[PDB]
Amino acid sequence: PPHGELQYLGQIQHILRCGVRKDDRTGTGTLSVFGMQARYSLRDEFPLLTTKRVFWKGVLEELLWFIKGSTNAKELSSKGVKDLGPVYGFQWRHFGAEYRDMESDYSGQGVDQLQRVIDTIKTNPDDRRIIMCAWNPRDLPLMALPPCHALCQFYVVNSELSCQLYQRSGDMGLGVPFNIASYALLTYMIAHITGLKPGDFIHTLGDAHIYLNHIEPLKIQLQREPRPFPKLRILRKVEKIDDFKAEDFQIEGYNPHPTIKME
Amino acid sequence: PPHGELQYLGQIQHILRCGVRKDDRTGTGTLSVFGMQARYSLRDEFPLLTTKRVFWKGVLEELLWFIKGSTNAKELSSKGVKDLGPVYGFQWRHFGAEYRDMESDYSGQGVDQLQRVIDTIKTNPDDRRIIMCAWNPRDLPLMALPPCHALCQFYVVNSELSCQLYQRSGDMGLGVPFNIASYALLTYMIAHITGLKPGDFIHTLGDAHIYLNHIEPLKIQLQREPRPFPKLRILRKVEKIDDFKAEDFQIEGYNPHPTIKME
């Protein structure tokens, strides 16, 4: 079968070739294509991109921090990756709650979107509503009922857990490789907790774009040949999504080309 | 260039070939694939499928009814297509409003999602938040903050308006061809009102499925060759989305294979 990373590289190449100039909200230029999708198998491999080195430890640490529901920057800066307001973690665990402090106690305030996804997979694996949403926090005060920045839809069939992430815009150079790994990791965790095998990660974008200053590095990244994806091992049987810790995970066989600094 | 309907037919054929058995919430069986996408040009053609006859008049009438914000069934039954509660129209025009009657006056109650999409395209065409959402009404009383059934994200670049519809599940036999036409029509209307040319319609699904009783008819539909898509003419300069009427639209050059009854 063809290497899963070829989709990411085909998408870069399609944007370079067919993308149209468009400014982002700071008036910084991009090449843009609207509507893209890629599917990465999670079956016995883990889609941590190999045409550049992806900061796996930051992917893992940031996801655990989101899952703990934290809005404290220093809780992520101390584990080593560098009050944020109602960031993704707060919205995953306390959705719709009126945000106050980063110290405040939020037990049973708002909808726990993430536990609801896991509970729905256990009570009804066929459910077509196994969906979590996140907001860009800067949109919250801008208007009533602002639209979501991203949604994850989960799906189970034949003991396999799949996830589709829809993001209204995707920074192909910097954000995309990192998010492929984050949400593939979230799928692996949720699969492990609900007793399922990881299936596919489907990544869908609205405005898929490349920043102008990333074109040159991506052109070079495009000549590199992917190496077989690594595997992700979970080392301990874990019961609750809140119990995972960084040391429960081991990336095995990761053999990337060198780091590319974008920006 | 290849005919746009080949994507729909390739998707059917991929589901027949690779789809997995899965039950829907009434325990009725389907063949299912998770995560699909197709893009249909709207530039000088209109994606009304030709491998079967699509009930265009019902597509048009139902969309005008949604846009008028109506929750009265007889307002759609009298124009000829056969109190519904807070259906799609009410959510498009009066989003987040506490639903009462179908007779009740809702002027300035809730967010007008549809006018907000049109106003945002006029005030900031680059905006990455040009998004409307709809809910399956049966989900509304089921839990707090239930997930959306579908979202439309719009996108403008080089005077062209594109739309991406994400639906958490797609009935490929009955609902999909009809929705391709409805949302392509919504794009044409919004383009016309904002002075833009229609771009692409991107249709993205979570659970793309075929009901078991539709397999045979779709197998036959698969041997039919698409004919060039028709065009859609808008006959009058229209100013406000509320002013369109059925007679402002003419489908031209529509040459379909025969009707297939599904179900």
From Swiss-Prot, chains A, B:
Effect seen on changing E62K: In DKCD; uncertain significance
Protein name in UniProt: Thymidylate synthase
PROSITE patterns the record matches: THYMIDYLATE_SYNTHASE
Organism: Homo sapiens (Human)
One Gene Ontology term from the biological process aspect of the record: dTTP biosynthetic process
Protein residues bound to (6R)-5,10-methylene-5,6,7,8-tetrahydrofolate: D171
GO CC terms, sorted: cytoplasm; cytosol; mitochondrial inner membrane; mitochondrial matrix; mitochondrion; nucleus
InterPro entries (alphabetical): Thymidate_synth/dCMP_Mease (IPR045097), Thymidate_synth/dCMP_Mease_dom (IPR023451), Thymidate_synth/dCMP_Mease_sf (IPR036926), Thymidylate_synthase (IPR000398), Thymidylate_synthase_AS (IPR020940)
Enzyme Commission no: 2.1.1.45
Biological or metabolic pathway of the protein: Pyrimidine metabolism; dTTP biosynthesis
